[PDB]
From Swiss-Prot:
<dbReference type="InterPro" id="IPR045155">
    <property type="entry name" value="Beta-lactam_cat"/>
</dbReference>
<protein>
    <recommendedName>
        <fullName>Beta-lactamase TEM</fullName>
        <ecNumber>3.5.2.6</ecNumber>
    </recommendedName>
</protein>
<keyword id="KW-0046">Antibiotic resistance</keyword>
<keyword id="KW-1015">Disulfide bond</keyword>
<feature type="binding site">
    <location>
        <begin position="209"/>
        <end position="211"/>
    </location>
    <ligand>
        <name>substrate</name>
    </ligand>
</feature>
<comment type="function">
    <text>TEM-type are the most prevalent beta-lactamases in enterobacteria; they hydrolyze the beta-lactam bond in susceptible beta-lactam antibiotics, thus conferring resistance to penicillins and cephalosporins. TEM-3 and TEM-4 are capable of hydrolyzing cefotaxime and ceftazidime. TEM-5 is capable of hydrolyzing ceftazidime. TEM-6 is capable of hydrolyzing ceftazidime and aztreonam. TEM-8/CAZ-2, TEM-16/CAZ-7 and TEM-24/CAZ-6 are markedly active against ceftazidime. IRT-4 shows resistance to beta-lactamase inhibitors.</text>
</comment>
<dbReference type="InterPro" id="IPR000871">
    <property type="entry name" value="Beta-lactam_class-A"/>
</dbReference>
<dbReference type="GO" id="GO:0030655">
    <property type="term" value="P:beta-lactam antibiotic catabolic process"/>
</dbReference>
<keyword id="KW-0814">Transposable element</keyword>
<feature type="active site" description="Acyl-ester intermediate">
    <location>
        <position position="45"/>
    </location>
</feature>
<dbReference type="InterPro" id="IPR012338">
    <property type="entry name" value="Beta-lactam/transpept-like"/>
</dbReference>
<feature type="disulfide bond">
    <location>
        <begin position="52"/>
        <end position="98"/>
    </location>
</feature>
<keyword id="KW-0732">Signal</keyword>
<dbReference type="GO" id="GO:0008800">
    <property type="term" value="F:beta-lactamase activity"/>
</dbReference>
<keyword id="KW-0378">Hydrolase</keyword>
<comment type="similarity">
    <text>Belongs to the class-A beta-lactamase family.</text>
</comment>
<dbReference type="InterPro" id="IPR023650">
    <property type="entry name" value="Beta-lactam_class-A_AS"/>
</dbReference>
Amino acid sequence: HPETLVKVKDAEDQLGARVGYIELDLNSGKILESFRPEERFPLTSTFKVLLCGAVLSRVDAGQEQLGRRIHYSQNDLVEYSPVTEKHLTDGMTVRELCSAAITMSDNTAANLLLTTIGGPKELTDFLRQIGDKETRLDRIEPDLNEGKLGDLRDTTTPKAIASTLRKLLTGELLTLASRQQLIDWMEADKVAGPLLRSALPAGWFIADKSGAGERGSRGIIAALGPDGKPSRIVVIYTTGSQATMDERNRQIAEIGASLIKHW
Ligand SMILES: [Cl-]
Ligand SMILES: [Cl-]
Ligand SMILES: [Cl-]
Ligand SMILES: [Cl-]
Ligand SMILES: [Mg+2]
Ligand SMILES: [Mg+2]
Ligand SMILES: [Mg+2]
């Protein structure tokens, strides 16, 4: 909607950075709205949904078990690891790690999951296999969050990741049980959801994953809609801003508020 595009432009002006935006119809994949849809942005922590997709593909294939216990050590622990820092001595199962990575934004959990699949290159190969030609993961947390100028590492485009999320959450890439488990993780309540959840109306469905990195990187991918059922995918990315985190959050949240208002 033009009203949403105005809010995307206002965000670029206020934040002093590029903003990328896409909305897709969930059922058809038709592009409803877009702004800088094929420009590159850091994935930031939005990659964690793609990662758990890859894990679930391996579960479907009999190559991984959700109940497999992963044991790890103190120097696997990186910053922003609220769940994994509670399990150094007992380990965590693969399903516990995906829940932690997606719902609690746990960096160590995502790194351990990356190990389970064989690393960033294997995630990139899985993406290529399912038809995503743009998205790339090169590094693990927190390195992938650096957001360096002119660096193509750990980037996607809004259009590419929107299409990939649609492939994972709908149709036949994952089994129904896997599809439902990924949605469950993404729908689970989080500690704070400033970008879309905070103002989302009661009774709306939302399955989302946000990310924040260095150098102004911020992103969210989501499936959402009224009446407890998703009907659109929205992706919003920015990088480069040196505005405060609160200002960055507020400008992105206004884009979401407009999407909902003019739905
Ligand atoms: Cl454009
Ligand atoms: Cl573009
Ligand atoms: Cl492993
Ligand atoms: Cl959020
Ligand atoms: Mg050990
Ligand atoms: Mg649930
Ligand atoms: Mg809820």
